[PDB]
Design a protein around this ligand. Structure first.
Ligand code: NA
Length: 330
């Protein structure tokens, strides 16, 4: 690695380079992070259930460690995530009697969470995924069901963005989602963000999770989605990038190593993707991977528990893969 290029330096004129982390992987992958990234996201410890597990009980210790690491290495931090249909405790939606709370009460609890969390990290965290994954991933409706939406109404996203803006008006506020380049879902995401901006809501950015495979989305699809979203005037971040060795239909559990063909195609795929990101450097300002090396990835257990995946630029021994060399040479 002594003579290896540094990802953040190669892309210094193009976008930040980030990694998702937790206190354990910061220790396990510390030198790779130090050597390559200039942005960090908490993989899990800034989600609602990890910050306010019980009402009025805030547990910032893990998030604090992650921010302390970033700040001491001059890394930016993306805050992930305030309002989501997952990893939010049941207390949030319920009264003492157990019934669902009212719209007004859920808005007070949303405001209190957002205010307390965003104000704690103001001046250290420069952007927040305020709404995560509200758009439907299947069927014809615009929006996914969620208790947030059930109890407040469809203006729950408007309110979340306004509460976060009040808590830190210097932050960039994002709508973040996956399968963001499939045309039907891209059109829903575009319509939704257009409608919020058309009302003056402080949404500044779209986060493209980019939980991609070797084949999907196509490069034409990615291009079209970047152009579509940029045409709204928002900032784009690629927020959770990984390139799975398995397509969505491939639920094999048996593979103990990637084939040479998978490794080669993944290298080609990452070179193609980075070439496209560099081409859109004027609208893409950050590319975060959902990890940094193949010794830690949520894809080992999702969508199939207990297998192994190899989605990143560095292998389990933290050495560069064929994908690294193509990514850095665009
Ligand atoms: Na840029």
């Amino acid at each position: 690695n002594s003579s290896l290029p540094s990802l953040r330096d190669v892309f210094a004129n193009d976008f930040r380079i980030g990694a998702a982390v937790n206190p354990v992987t910061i220790e396990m992958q510390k030198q790779l992070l130090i050597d390559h990234v200039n942005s960090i996201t908490a993989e899990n410890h800034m989600k609602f259930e990890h910050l306010q597990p019980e009402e009025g009980k805030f547990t910032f210790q893990e998030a604090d460690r992650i921010v302390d690491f970033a700040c001491s290495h001059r890394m930016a931090v993306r805050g992930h995530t305030l309002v989501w249909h997952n990893q939010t405790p049941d207390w949030v939606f319920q009264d003492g009697q157990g019934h669902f709370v009212s719209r007004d009460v859920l808005l007070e609890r949303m405001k209190c969470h957002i205010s307390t969390v965003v104000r704690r990290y103001k001046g250290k965290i420069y952007c927040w995924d305020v709404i995560n994954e509200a758009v439907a991933d299947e069927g014809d409706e615009l929006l996914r069901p969620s208790k947030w939406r059930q109890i407040i109404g469809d203006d729950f996203m408007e309110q979340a963005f306004l509460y976060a803006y009040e808590a830190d008006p210097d932050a960039l506020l994002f709508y973040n989602d996956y399968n963001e380049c499939f045309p039907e879902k891209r059109e829903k995401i575009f319509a939704l963000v257009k409608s919020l901006r058309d009302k003056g809501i402080p949404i500044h950015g779209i986060g493209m999770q980019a939980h991609w495979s070797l084949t999907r989305p196509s490069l034409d699809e990615i291009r079209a989605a970047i152009e579509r979203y940029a045409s709204l005037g928002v900032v784009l971040h690629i927020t959770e990038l990984d390139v799975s060795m398995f397509e969505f239909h491939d639920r094999r559990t048996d593979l103990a190593a990637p084939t040479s063909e998978m490794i080669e195609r993944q290298a080609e795929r990452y070179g193609q993707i980075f070439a496209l990101f560099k081409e859109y450097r004027d609208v893409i300002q950050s590319v975060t991977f959902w990890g940094i090396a193949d010794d830690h990835t949520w894809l080992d257990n999702f969508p199939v528990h207990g297998r192994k995946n190899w989605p990143l630029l560095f292998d389990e021994q933290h050495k560069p893969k064929p994908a690294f060399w193509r990514a850095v040479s665009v």
